[PDB]
Amino acid sequence: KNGDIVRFHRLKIQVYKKETQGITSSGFASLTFEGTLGAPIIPRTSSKYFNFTTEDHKMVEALRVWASTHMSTLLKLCDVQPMQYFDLTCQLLGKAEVDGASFLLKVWDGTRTPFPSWRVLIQDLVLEGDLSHIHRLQNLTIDILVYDNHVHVARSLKVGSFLRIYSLHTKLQSMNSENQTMLSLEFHLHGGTSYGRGIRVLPESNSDVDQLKKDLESANLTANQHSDVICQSEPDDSF
Protein backbone atom coordinates (compact mmCIF):
# COMPACT_ATOMS: atom_id res chain seq x y z
CA LYS A 1 0.00 0.00 0.00
CA ASN A 2 0.95 3.63 -0.39
CA GLY A 3 2.45 4.68 2.91
CA ASP A 4 4.49 1.52 3.32
CA ILE A 5 8.08 2.25 4.38
CA VAL A 6 10.88 0.72 2.28
CA ARG A 7 14.63 0.25 2.81
CA PHE A 8 16.87 -0.45 -0.21
CA HIS A 9 20.57 -1.30 0.20
CA ARG A 10 23.14 -1.64 -2.60
CA LEU A 11 20.52 0.10 -4.72
CA LYS A 12 22.23 1.02 -8.00
CA ILE A 13 21.17 4.42 -9.32
CA GLN A 14 20.70 5.02 -13.04
CA VAL A 15 19.77 8.04 -15.18
CA TYR A 16 17.39 8.66 -18.09
CA LYS A 17 17.37 12.15 -19.62
CA LYS A 18 18.69 13.50 -16.30
CA GLU A 19 15.82 11.63 -14.60
CA THR A 20 17.57 9.63 -11.88
CA GLN A 21 16.12 6.26 -10.87
CA GLY A 22 17.15 3.20 -8.86
CA ILE A 23 17.40 -0.43 -10.01
CA THR A 24 17.71 -3.86 -8.36
CA SER A 25 21.49 -4.13 -8.60
CA SER A 26 23.83 -7.07 -8.42
CA GLY A 27 24.37 -7.53 -4.68
CA PHE A 28 21.10 -5.73 -3.86
CA ALA A 29 19.25 -6.02 -0.52
CA SER A 30 16.03 -4.64 0.96
CA LEU A 31 13.49 -4.41 3.79
CA THR A 32 9.92 -3.06 4.07
CA PHE A 33 7.52 -2.35 6.94
CA GLU A 34 3.94 -1.44 7.86
CA GLY A 35 2.92 2.23 7.87
CA THR A 36 0.58 2.34 10.88
CA LEU A 37 1.39 4.21 14.08
CA GLY A 38 0.31 2.40 17.24
CA ALA A 39 1.44 -1.00 15.94
CA PRO A 40 4.67 -3.04 15.79
CA ILE A 41 7.42 -2.90 13.17
CA ILE A 42 7.26 -6.30 11.42
CA PRO A 43 9.81 -6.88 8.61
CA ARG A 44 8.66 -7.72 5.08
CA THR A 45 11.61 -8.71 2.87
CA SER A 46 12.97 -11.27 0.42
CA SER A 47 16.70 -10.45 0.59
CA LYS A 48 19.49 -12.13 2.59
CA TYR A 49 19.29 -12.45 6.36
CA PHE A 50 19.56 -9.09 8.10
CA ASN A 51 20.19 -7.35 11.42
CA PHE A 52 17.81 -4.59 12.47
CA THR A 53 19.08 -1.64 14.49
CA THR A 54 17.54 1.02 16.70
CA GLU A 55 18.53 3.67 14.15
CA ASP A 56 16.85 1.59 11.43
CA HIS A 57 13.58 1.03 13.31
CA LYS A 58 13.62 4.67 14.41
CA MET A 59 13.88 5.64 10.75
CA VAL A 60 10.73 3.57 10.24
CA GLU A 61 8.94 5.27 13.15
CA ALA A 62 10.09 8.72 11.99
CA LEU A 63 8.82 8.06 8.47
CA ARG A 64 5.52 6.92 9.99
CA VAL A 65 5.22 10.15 11.99
CA TRP A 66 6.30 12.14 8.93
CA ALA A 67 3.85 10.67 6.44
CA SER A 68 1.15 10.88 9.11
CA THR A 69 1.45 14.54 10.17
CA HIS A 70 4.28 16.30 8.24
CA MET A 71 3.36 15.21 4.73
CA SER A 72 -0.23 14.26 5.60
CA THR A 73 -8.94 5.72 2.31
CA LEU A 74 -11.24 2.83 3.24
CA LEU A 75 -14.43 1.83 1.44
CA LYS A 76 -16.88 -1.02 1.91
CA LEU A 77 -18.70 -2.24 -1.18
CA CYS A 78 -21.92 -0.96 0.38
CA ASP A 79 -20.57 2.62 0.42
CA VAL A 80 -19.55 3.01 -3.24
CA GLN A 81 -20.66 5.69 -5.72
CA PRO A 82 -22.24 5.07 -9.12
CA MET A 83 -19.24 5.64 -11.41
CA GLN A 84 -15.71 6.21 -10.12
CA TYR A 85 -12.66 4.19 -9.10
CA PHE A 86 -11.23 2.65 -5.95
CA ASP A 87 -8.53 0.30 -4.65
CA LEU A 88 -10.94 -2.42 -3.61
CA THR A 89 -9.93 -5.46 -1.56
CA CYS A 90 -11.81 -8.77 -1.51
CA GLN A 91 -11.55 -12.55 -1.66
CA LEU A 92 -11.77 -14.36 -4.99
CA LEU A 93 -14.78 -16.68 -5.13
CA GLY A 94 -14.18 -17.75 -8.73
CA LYS A 95 -12.63 -16.95 -12.10
CA ALA A 96 -13.88 -17.45 -15.66
CA GLU A 97 -13.69 -16.04 -19.19
CA VAL A 98 -15.40 -15.73 -22.54
CA ASP A 99 -13.12 -15.66 -25.57
CA GLY A 100 -11.93 -12.09 -25.96
CA ALA A 101 -9.80 -9.28 -24.57
CA SER A 102 -11.26 -9.70 -21.08
CA PHE A 103 -11.31 -12.02 -18.08
CA LEU A 104 -13.78 -12.45 -15.21
CA LEU A 105 -13.16 -12.44 -11.45
CA LYS A 106 -15.95 -12.97 -8.90
CA VAL A 107 -15.42 -11.69 -5.34
CA TRP A 108 -17.25 -10.70 -2.16
CA ASP A 109 -16.94 -8.24 0.72
CA GLY A 110 -19.78 -9.26 3.05
CA THR A 111 -21.66 -5.98 2.55
CA ARG A 112 -24.61 -5.19 0.29
CA THR A 113 -23.92 -3.24 -2.89
CA PRO A 114 -26.45 -0.37 -3.18
CA PHE A 115 -27.65 -1.53 -6.54
CA PRO A 116 -27.24 -5.20 -7.41
CA SER A 117 -23.99 -5.93 -9.23
CA TRP A 118 -23.85 -6.48 -12.95
CA ARG A 119 -24.20 -10.18 -13.82
CA VAL A 120 -22.31 -11.55 -16.82
CA LEU A 121 -23.60 -13.81 -19.60
CA ILE A 122 -20.73 -16.18 -18.83
CA GLN A 123 -20.06 -19.60 -20.29
CA ASP A 124 -20.61 -21.22 -16.91
CA LEU A 125 -18.40 -24.20 -17.75
CA VAL A 126 -15.33 -21.93 -17.68
CA LEU A 127 -15.95 -20.77 -14.10
CA GLU A 128 -13.78 -22.15 -11.31
CA GLY A 129 -15.38 -21.99 -7.88
CA ASP A 130 -17.40 -23.74 -5.19
CA LEU A 131 -21.17 -23.18 -5.07
CA SER A 132 -21.47 -24.07 -1.38
CA HIS A 133 -20.07 -20.75 -0.13
CA ILE A 134 -21.97 -18.70 -2.75
CA HIS A 135 -25.48 -19.46 -3.88
CA ARG A 136 -27.70 -18.63 -0.89
CA LEU A 137 -25.55 -15.57 -0.14
CA GLN A 138 -25.14 -14.41 -3.75
CA ASN A 139 -26.67 -11.03 -2.86
CA LEU A 140 -23.37 -10.21 -1.10
CA THR A 141 -21.15 -11.04 -4.12
CA ILE A 142 -20.06 -9.11 -7.22
CA ASP A 143 -18.30 -9.43 -10.58
CA ILE A 144 -15.26 -7.68 -12.06
CA LEU A 145 -13.95 -7.63 -15.63
CA VAL A 146 -10.25 -7.09 -16.32
CA TYR A 147 -8.74 -6.49 -19.74
CA ASP A 148 -5.63 -6.90 -21.87
CA ASN A 149 -2.49 -7.22 -19.73
CA HIS A 150 -4.63 -8.04 -16.69
CA VAL A 151 -5.97 -11.10 -18.54
CA HIS A 152 -2.79 -13.15 -18.21
CA VAL A 153 -2.56 -12.15 -14.54
CA ALA A 154 -6.18 -13.01 -13.80
CA ARG A 155 -5.90 -16.19 -15.87
CA SER A 156 -2.88 -17.29 -13.81
CA LEU A 157 -4.68 -16.72 -10.50
CA LYS A 158 -6.05 -19.36 -8.14
CA VAL A 159 -9.42 -19.12 -6.41
CA GLY A 160 -9.58 -18.68 -2.64
CA SER A 161 -6.90 -16.05 -2.00
CA PHE A 162 -7.18 -12.37 -1.08
CA LEU A 163 -6.66 -9.51 -3.53
CA ARG A 164 -6.47 -5.72 -3.64
CA ILE A 165 -7.73 -4.32 -6.94
CA TYR A 166 -5.91 -1.01 -7.28
CA SER A 167 -7.97 1.59 -9.16
CA LEU A 168 -10.99 -0.61 -9.76
CA HIS A 169 -13.48 1.15 -12.02
CA THR A 170 -17.12 1.48 -11.03
CA LYS A 171 -19.82 2.27 -13.58
CA LEU A 172 -23.60 2.53 -13.52
CA GLN A 173 -25.92 0.04 -15.21
CA SER A 174 -29.63 0.53 -15.89
CA MET A 175 -30.86 -2.23 -18.25
CA ASN A 176 -31.42 -5.98 -18.54
CA SER A 177 -30.63 -8.36 -21.40
CA GLU A 178 -34.12 -7.91 -22.87
CA ASN A 179 -33.77 -4.14 -22.33
CA GLN A 180 -36.11 -3.82 -19.39
CA THR A 181 -35.00 -1.23 -16.86
CA MET A 182 -32.96 -2.32 -13.86
CA LEU A 183 -30.49 -0.23 -11.88
CA SER A 184 -27.18 -2.00 -11.29
CA LEU A 185 -23.46 -1.47 -10.71
CA GLU A 186 -20.63 -2.48 -13.05
CA PHE A 187 -16.97 -3.11 -12.21
CA HIS A 188 -14.02 -3.10 -14.59
CA LEU A 189 -10.23 -2.93 -14.78
CA HIS A 190 -8.87 -1.36 -17.96
CA GLY A 191 -5.74 -2.67 -19.61
CA GLY A 192 -2.41 -1.03 -18.98
CA THR A 193 -0.99 -0.02 -15.61
CA SER A 194 -1.31 3.74 -16.14
CA TYR A 195 -2.63 5.58 -13.08
CA GLY A 196 -1.91 2.34 -11.21
CA ARG A 197 -4.59 -0.03 -12.48
CA GLY A 198 -3.62 -3.45 -11.18
CA ILE A 199 -3.99 -6.30 -8.72
CA ARG A 200 -1.70 -7.72 -6.05
CA VAL A 201 -2.27 -10.92 -4.10
CA LEU A 202 -2.58 -10.09 -0.43
CA PRO A 203 -0.88 -12.29 2.19
CA GLU A 204 -3.17 -13.75 4.80
CA SER A 205 -0.78 -12.33 7.41
CA ASN A 206 -1.71 -8.75 6.46
CA SER A 207 -3.58 -6.76 9.10
CA ASP A 208 -6.03 -5.60 6.43
CA VAL A 209 -6.99 -9.24 5.99
CA ASP A 210 -7.42 -9.44 9.76
CA GLN A 211 -9.76 -6.45 9.52
CA LEU A 212 -11.76 -8.10 6.73
CA LYS A 213 -11.98 -11.32 8.77
CA LYS A 214 -13.08 -9.31 11.82
CA ASP A 215 -15.82 -7.74 9.70
CA LEU A 216 -17.28 -11.05 8.53
CA GLU A 217 -17.40 -12.25 12.15
CA SER A 218 -20.35 -9.88 12.51
CA ALA A 219 -21.72 -10.50 9.01
CA ASN A 220 -22.53 -14.12 9.94
CA LEU A 221 -23.25 -14.45 13.68
CA THR A 222 -25.01 -11.08 14.03
CA ALA A 223 -26.17 -11.36 10.41
CA ASN A 224 -29.89 -10.73 11.08
CA GLN A 225 -30.37 -12.28 7.63
CA HIS A 226 -33.27 -14.52 6.69
CA SER A 227 -33.18 -18.30 6.61
CA ASP A 228 -30.93 -20.50 4.51
CA VAL A 229 -30.05 -24.18 4.43
CA ILE A 230 -33.75 -24.99 4.78
CA CYS A 231 -32.49 -28.54 4.26
CA GLN A 232 -31.65 -28.70 7.98
CA SER A 233 -30.96 -32.44 7.61
CA GLU A 234 -27.82 -31.61 5.60
CA PRO A 235 -25.07 -30.55 8.06
CA ASP A 236 -24.62 -33.54 10.42
CA ASP A 237 -21.74 -31.43 11.83
CA SER A 238 -18.56 -33.54 11.99
CA PHE A 239 -20.16 -36.51 10.27
Binding site: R112, P114, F115, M182, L183, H226
Partner: protein, 361 residues
Amino acid sequence: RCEEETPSLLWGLDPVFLAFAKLYIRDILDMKESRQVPGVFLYNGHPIKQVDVLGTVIGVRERDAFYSYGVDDSTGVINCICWKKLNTESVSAAPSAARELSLTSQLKKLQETIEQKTKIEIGDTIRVRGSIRTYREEREIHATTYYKVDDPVWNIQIARMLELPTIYRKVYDQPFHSSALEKEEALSNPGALDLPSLTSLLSEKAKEFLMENRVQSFYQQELEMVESLLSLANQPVIHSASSDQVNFKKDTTSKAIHSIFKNAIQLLQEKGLVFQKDDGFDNLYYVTREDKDLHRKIHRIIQQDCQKPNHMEKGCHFLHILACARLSIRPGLSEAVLQQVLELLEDQSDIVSTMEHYYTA
Protein backbone atom coordinates in the same frame (compact mmCIF):
# COMPACT_ATOMS: atom_id res chain seq x y z
CA ARG B 1 -41.68 33.54 41.60
CA CYS B 2 -38.80 32.86 39.23
CA GLU B 3 -38.78 29.08 39.69
CA GLU B 4 -42.52 29.07 39.04
CA GLU B 5 -41.97 31.36 36.03
CA THR B 6 -40.56 28.56 33.90
CA PRO B 7 -38.99 29.19 30.47
CA SER B 8 -41.17 31.05 28.04
CA LEU B 9 -43.81 29.08 26.11
CA LEU B 10 -43.42 26.31 28.74
CA TRP B 11 -41.56 23.83 26.59
CA GLY B 12 -42.28 20.12 26.62
CA LEU B 13 -38.95 19.25 28.16
CA ASP B 14 -41.12 18.38 31.13
CA PRO B 15 -43.03 15.37 29.76
CA VAL B 16 -46.42 15.98 31.37
CA PHE B 17 -47.31 18.59 28.79
CA LEU B 18 -48.13 15.85 26.28
CA ALA B 19 -50.12 13.43 28.47
CA PHE B 20 -53.41 13.54 30.36
CA ALA B 21 -52.65 14.60 33.95
CA LYS B 22 -54.33 13.33 37.13
CA LEU B 23 -54.97 16.13 39.67
CA TYR B 24 -57.61 16.53 42.36
CA ILE B 25 -60.68 18.14 40.86
CA ARG B 26 -60.52 20.83 43.56
CA ASP B 27 -57.01 21.78 42.44
CA ILE B 28 -58.07 22.16 38.81
CA LEU B 29 -59.44 25.62 39.60
CA ASP B 30 -56.58 26.80 41.82
CA MET B 31 -54.13 26.63 38.91
CA LYS B 32 -53.35 29.72 36.85
CA GLU B 33 -53.92 30.17 33.17
CA SER B 34 -50.69 31.13 31.44
CA ARG B 35 -50.39 34.85 30.82
CA GLN B 36 -48.08 34.10 27.89
CA VAL B 37 -50.65 32.17 25.86
CA PRO B 38 -54.30 31.21 26.40
CA GLY B 39 -55.41 27.61 26.40
CA VAL B 40 -52.68 26.37 28.77
CA PHE B 41 -52.45 26.30 32.55
CA LEU B 42 -49.82 25.93 35.24
CA TYR B 43 -49.25 23.94 38.42
CA ASN B 44 -46.01 24.00 40.40
CA GLY B 45 -44.27 25.07 37.19
CA HIS B 46 -45.17 21.97 35.21
CA PRO B 47 -47.40 23.10 32.32
CA ILE B 48 -50.69 21.30 31.78
CA LYS B 49 -53.10 21.15 28.87
CA GLN B 50 -54.62 17.67 28.87
CA VAL B 51 -56.39 16.64 32.08
CA ASP B 52 -57.93 13.43 33.39
CA VAL B 53 -60.66 13.41 36.04
CA LEU B 54 -63.21 10.86 37.25
CA GLY B 55 -66.14 11.41 39.60
CA THR B 56 -69.95 11.47 39.56
CA VAL B 57 -72.31 13.59 37.50
CA ILE B 58 -74.76 15.76 39.42
CA GLY B 59 -76.43 18.04 36.87
CA VAL B 60 -77.21 18.30 33.16
CA ARG B 61 -77.80 20.96 30.53
CA GLU B 62 -78.51 19.37 27.14
CA ARG B 63 -77.82 21.25 23.91
CA ASP B 64 -77.97 20.60 20.18
CA ALA B 65 -74.21 20.21 19.68
CA PHE B 66 -73.00 19.31 23.18
CA TYR B 67 -74.09 18.28 26.61
CA SER B 68 -72.91 20.08 29.73
CA TYR B 69 -72.46 17.75 32.69
CA GLY B 70 -71.76 18.99 36.18
CA VAL B 71 -69.29 16.65 37.85
CA ASP B 72 -68.16 16.17 41.43
CA ASP B 73 -65.28 14.34 43.05
CA SER B 74 -65.27 14.84 46.78
CA THR B 75 -62.75 17.67 46.94
CA GLY B 76 -64.66 19.86 44.51
CA VAL B 77 -66.92 20.28 41.50
CA ILE B 78 -66.82 21.58 37.92
CA ASN B 79 -68.85 21.46 34.70
CA CYS B 80 -67.76 19.66 31.54
CA ILE B 81 -68.48 20.43 27.87
CA CYS B 82 -69.12 17.02 26.28
CA TRP B 83 -69.34 17.53 22.54
CA LYS B 84 -71.80 15.13 20.96
CA LYS B 85 -71.47 13.09 17.80
CA LEU B 86 -74.10 11.97 15.30
CA ASN B 87 -74.30 8.67 13.41
CA THR B 88 -74.06 10.14 9.91
CA GLU B 89 -73.72 7.47 7.23
CA SER B 90 -76.10 5.08 8.95
CA VAL B 91 -75.25 1.38 8.94
CA SER B 92 -78.32 -0.63 7.97
CA ALA B 93 -79.44 -3.96 9.45
CA ALA B 94 -79.90 -6.53 6.69
CA PRO B 95 -79.74 -10.32 6.28
CA SER B 96 -76.29 -10.20 4.72
CA ALA B 97 -74.17 -13.26 3.96
CA ALA B 98 -72.17 -15.03 6.67
CA ARG B 99 -69.13 -12.75 6.59
CA GLU B 100 -71.05 -9.54 5.91
CA LEU B 101 -73.73 -10.45 8.44
CA SER B 102 -71.03 -11.12 11.03
CA LEU B 103 -69.24 -7.86 10.28
CA THR B 104 -72.44 -5.83 10.49
CA SER B 105 -73.52 -7.64 13.65
CA GLN B 106 -70.23 -7.12 15.47
CA LEU B 107 -70.25 -3.50 14.35
CA LYS B 108 -73.74 -3.18 15.81
CA LYS B 109 -72.67 -4.80 19.07
CA LEU B 110 -69.81 -2.32 19.31
CA GLN B 111 -72.07 0.60 18.41
CA GLU B 112 -74.86 -0.20 20.87
CA THR B 113 -72.43 -0.85 23.69
CA ILE B 114 -70.67 2.42 22.87
CA GLU B 115 -74.05 4.11 23.21
CA GLN B 116 -74.58 2.46 26.58
CA LYS B 117 -71.16 3.74 27.66
CA THR B 118 -71.97 7.21 26.29
CA LYS B 119 -75.47 7.71 27.67
CA ILE B 120 -75.56 8.86 31.25
CA GLU B 121 -77.80 9.83 34.16
CA ILE B 122 -77.22 11.85 37.32
CA GLY B 123 -75.40 10.15 40.18
CA ASP B 124 -73.46 7.91 37.83
CA THR B 125 -69.69 7.62 37.71
CA ILE B 126 -68.14 9.31 34.69
CA ARG B 127 -64.65 9.55 33.17
CA VAL B 128 -63.54 12.35 30.86
CA ARG B 129 -60.34 12.90 28.90
CA GLY B 130 -59.87 16.46 27.70
CA SER B 131 -58.42 19.92 28.24
CA ILE B 132 -59.02 23.05 30.31
CA ARG B 133 -61.12 25.86 28.84
CA THR B 134 -62.74 28.95 30.35
CA TYR B 135 -65.88 30.82 29.36
CA ARG B 136 -68.08 33.52 30.91
CA GLU B 137 -65.14 33.83 33.34
CA GLU B 138 -65.90 30.22 34.45
CA ARG B 139 -63.38 27.39 34.10
CA GLU B 140 -64.50 24.07 32.59
CA ILE B 141 -63.29 20.93 30.80
CA HIS B 142 -63.87 20.21 27.11
CA ALA B 143 -63.60 16.46 26.90
CA THR B 144 -61.81 14.65 24.12
CA THR B 145 -63.36 11.36 25.24
CA TYR B 146 -65.85 10.41 27.94
CA TYR B 147 -67.35 7.10 28.99
CA LYS B 148 -69.46 5.62 31.77
CA VAL B 149 -67.39 3.87 34.44
CA ASP B 150 -68.99 0.43 34.60
CA ASP B 151 -67.87 -0.40 38.15
CA PRO B 152 -70.48 -2.06 40.40
CA VAL B 153 -68.59 -1.07 43.56
CA TRP B 154 -66.39 1.76 44.81
CA ASN B 155 -63.18 -0.30 44.58
CA ILE B 156 -61.74 1.56 41.59
CA GLN B 157 -62.83 4.89 43.03
CA ILE B 158 -61.05 3.78 46.19
CA ALA B 159 -57.93 2.99 44.20
CA ARG B 160 -57.90 6.41 42.57
CA MET B 161 -58.55 8.14 45.88
CA LEU B 162 -55.62 6.34 47.48
CA GLU B 163 -53.43 6.93 44.45
CA LEU B 164 -53.71 10.62 43.67
CA PRO B 165 -51.62 11.68 46.70
CA THR B 166 -48.98 9.19 45.61
CA ILE B 167 -48.64 10.54 42.08
CA TYR B 168 -48.76 14.07 43.47
CA ARG B 169 -45.82 13.49 45.79
CA LYS B 170 -43.88 11.46 43.23
CA VAL B 171 -44.27 13.59 40.10
CA TYR B 172 -46.36 16.71 40.37
CA ASP B 173 -44.92 18.12 43.58
CA GLN B 174 -41.48 18.16 41.92
CA PRO B 175 -40.93 21.77 40.82
CA PHE B 176 -37.29 21.72 39.81
CA HIS B 177 -36.08 22.45 36.28
CA SER B 178 -33.04 20.40 35.27
CA SER B 179 -32.46 22.05 31.88
CA ALA B 180 -28.96 23.38 31.31
CA LEU B 181 -30.35 26.71 30.01
CA GLU B 182 -28.09 27.13 26.99
CA LYS B 183 -29.26 30.60 26.00
CA GLU B 184 -27.53 32.75 23.39
CA GLU B 185 -28.42 35.85 25.45
CA ALA B 186 -28.50 38.44 22.67
CA LEU B 187 -24.86 38.40 21.60
CA SER B 188 -24.73 40.65 18.52
CA ASN B 189 -28.53 40.71 18.50
CA PRO B 190 -28.98 44.29 17.17
CA GLY B 191 -26.23 43.73 14.59
CA ALA B 192 -24.51 40.61 13.27
CA LEU B 193 -21.55 42.55 11.81
CA ASP B 194 -21.40 39.84 9.14
CA LEU B 195 -23.76 39.40 6.19
CA PRO B 196 -23.38 35.58 6.38
CA SER B 197 -24.22 35.68 10.09
CA LEU B 198 -27.13 38.01 9.42
CA THR B 199 -28.27 35.58 6.72
CA SER B 200 -28.06 32.64 9.12
CA LEU B 201 -30.14 34.40 11.77
CA LEU B 202 -32.51 35.57 9.03
CA SER B 203 -33.00 32.01 7.79
CA GLU B 204 -33.59 30.90 11.38
CA LYS B 205 -36.32 33.46 11.98
CA ALA B 206 -37.80 32.99 8.51
CA LYS B 207 -38.11 29.21 8.71
CA GLU B 208 -39.52 29.68 12.20
CA PHE B 209 -42.12 32.10 10.85
CA LEU B 210 -42.96 29.94 7.83
CA MET B 211 -43.46 26.83 9.94
CA GLU B 212 -45.59 29.00 12.21
CA ASN B 213 -47.78 30.25 9.36
CA ARG B 214 -47.75 26.77 7.77
CA VAL B 215 -47.19 28.34 4.34
CA GLN B 216 -46.38 25.57 1.87
CA SER B 217 -45.14 27.72 -1.03
CA PHE B 218 -44.16 31.34 -1.42
CA TYR B 219 -42.59 33.81 -3.81
CA GLN B 220 -39.43 35.22 -2.28
CA GLN B 221 -40.81 38.76 -2.49
CA GLU B 222 -43.76 37.63 -0.36
CA LEU B 223 -41.27 36.79 2.38
CA GLU B 224 -39.13 39.88 1.76
CA MET B 225 -42.13 42.00 2.81
CA VAL B 226 -42.61 40.46 6.27
CA GLU B 227 -42.36 43.06 9.03
CA SER B 228 -40.36 41.04 11.56
CA LEU B 229 -38.09 39.49 8.92
CA LEU B 230 -37.46 42.90 7.36
CA SER B 231 -36.71 44.43 10.77
CA LEU B 232 -34.23 41.63 11.42
CA ALA B 233 -32.61 42.05 8.00
CA ASN B 234 -32.39 45.86 7.88
CA GLN B 235 -30.23 46.17 11.00
CA PRO B 236 -27.39 48.71 10.73
CA VAL B 237 -24.99 45.99 9.59
CA ILE B 238 -26.48 45.73 6.10
CA HIS B 239 -26.80 49.51 5.84
CA SER B 240 -23.10 49.89 6.66
CA ALA B 241 -22.04 47.10 4.28
CA SER B 242 -24.04 48.55 1.36
CA SER B 243 -22.99 52.12 2.25
CA ASP B 244 -20.26 52.20 -0.42
CA GLN B 245 -22.97 53.57 -2.73
CA VAL B 246 -23.38 56.63 -0.54
CA ASN B 247 -25.44 58.43 -3.19
CA PHE B 248 -27.96 55.55 -3.18
CA LYS B 249 -28.02 54.35 0.44
CA LYS B 250 -31.73 53.53 0.19
CA ASP B 251 -31.54 51.76 -3.17
CA THR B 252 -28.30 49.88 -2.52
CA THR B 253 -29.48 48.82 0.94
CA SER B 254 -32.86 47.62 -0.34
CA LYS B 255 -31.12 45.66 -3.09
CA ALA B 256 -28.74 44.19 -0.50
CA ILE B 257 -31.76 43.26 1.62
CA HIS B 258 -33.35 41.47 -1.33
CA SER B 259 -30.03 39.75 -2.03
CA ILE B 260 -29.60 38.61 1.58
CA PHE B 261 -33.18 37.33 1.54
CA LYS B 262 -32.23 35.36 -1.56
CA ASN B 263 -29.17 34.17 0.37
CA ALA B 264 -31.31 33.04 3.31
CA ILE B 265 -33.71 31.06 1.13
CA GLN B 266 -30.70 29.59 -0.67
CA LEU B 267 -29.29 28.53 2.70
CA LEU B 268 -32.62 26.84 3.32
CA GLN B 269 -32.33 25.02 0.00
CA GLU B 270 -28.81 23.98 0.99
CA LYS B 271 -30.22 22.69 4.28
CA GLY B 272 -33.18 21.16 2.45
CA LEU B 273 -35.99 23.09 4.12
CA VAL B 274 -37.26 24.76 0.93
CA PHE B 275 -36.81 24.11 -2.77
CA GLN B 276 -37.79 25.61 -6.12
CA LYS B 277 -40.12 23.23 -7.91
CA ASP B 278 -39.85 22.94 -11.69
CA ASP B 279 -42.34 25.80 -11.85
CA GLY B 280 -40.36 27.86 -14.37
CA PHE B 281 -40.18 30.78 -11.93
CA ASP B 282 -37.04 32.44 -10.59
CA ASN B 283 -37.96 33.15 -6.95
CA LEU B 284 -40.78 30.69 -6.17
CA TYR B 285 -40.06 28.14 -3.45
CA TYR B 286 -41.87 25.18 -1.91
CA VAL B 287 -41.18 24.29 1.72
CA THR B 288 -40.32 20.64 2.28
CA ARG B 289 -41.85 20.47 5.75
CA GLU B 290 -45.28 21.24 4.28
CA ASP B 291 -44.55 19.05 1.23
CA LYS B 292 -47.06 16.39 2.25
CA ASP B 293 -47.13 15.46 -1.44
CA LEU B 294 -43.52 14.32 -1.61
CA HIS B 295 -43.94 12.73 1.81
CA ARG B 296 -46.80 10.65 0.42
CA LYS B 297 -44.89 9.71 -2.73
CA ILE B 298 -41.68 8.64 -1.02
CA HIS B 299 -43.85 6.80 1.49
CA ARG B 300 -45.59 4.98 -1.37
CA ILE B 301 -42.33 3.80 -2.88
CA ILE B 302 -41.45 1.70 0.18
CA GLN B 303 -44.58 1.47 2.33
CA GLN B 304 -45.66 -0.64 -0.58
CA ASP B 305 -42.58 -2.85 -0.69
CA CYS B 306 -39.95 -1.67 -3.16
CA GLN B 307 -41.56 -2.29 -6.52
CA LYS B 308 -38.51 -2.78 -8.75
CA PRO B 309 -36.93 -5.86 -7.09
CA ASN B 310 -38.55 -9.27 -7.29
CA HIS B 311 -36.67 -10.45 -4.20
CA MET B 312 -38.39 -10.05 -0.82
CA GLU B 313 -36.69 -6.80 0.13
CA LYS B 314 -37.39 -5.44 3.65
CA GLY B 315 -37.24 -1.82 2.36
CA CYS B 316 -34.78 0.10 0.21
CA HIS B 317 -31.35 1.68 0.22
CA PHE B 318 -30.70 5.41 0.48
CA LEU B 319 -29.18 5.56 -2.99
CA HIS B 320 -31.87 3.42 -4.62
CA ILE B 321 -34.52 5.37 -2.74
CA LEU B 322 -33.09 8.60 -4.14
CA ALA B 323 -32.67 7.09 -7.61
CA CYS B 324 -36.18 5.65 -7.85
CA ALA B 325 -37.57 8.97 -6.63
CA ARG B 326 -35.61 10.91 -9.24
CA LEU B 327 -36.70 8.34 -11.83
CA SER B 328 -40.40 8.44 -11.00
CA ILE B 329 -40.62 12.19 -10.26
CA ARG B 330 -37.66 14.40 -11.14
CA PRO B 331 -33.86 14.08 -11.32
CA GLY B 332 -33.58 17.58 -9.85
CA LEU B 333 -34.69 16.36 -6.42
CA SER B 334 -31.82 17.52 -4.20
CA GLU B 335 -30.36 15.18 -1.60
CA ALA B 336 -30.91 17.85 1.06
CA VAL B 337 -34.69 17.72 0.74
CA LEU B 338 -34.54 13.93 0.58
CA GLN B 339 -32.63 13.84 3.87
CA GLN B 340 -35.06 16.30 5.45
CA VAL B 341 -38.09 14.25 4.45
CA LEU B 342 -36.45 11.02 5.56
CA GLU B 343 -35.93 12.61 8.97
CA LEU B 344 -39.47 13.94 9.23
CA LEU B 345 -40.96 10.61 8.20
CA GLU B 346 -39.40 8.64 11.05
CA ASP B 347 -40.37 11.50 13.32
CA GLN B 348 -43.95 10.82 12.17
CA SER B 349 -43.50 7.02 12.37
CA ASP B 350 -43.92 6.79 8.58
CA ILE B 351 -40.42 5.34 8.13
CA VAL B 352 -37.91 3.54 10.36
CA SER B 353 -34.10 3.40 10.20
CA THR B 354 -33.27 -0.26 10.58
CA MET B 355 -29.73 0.96 9.86
CA GLU B 356 -28.09 3.94 8.26
CA HIS B 357 -28.52 4.19 4.47
CA TYR B 358 -31.30 1.54 4.38
CA TYR B 359 -34.84 2.15 5.56
CA THR B 360 -38.27 0.52 5.65
CA ALA B 361 -41.88 1.58 6.16
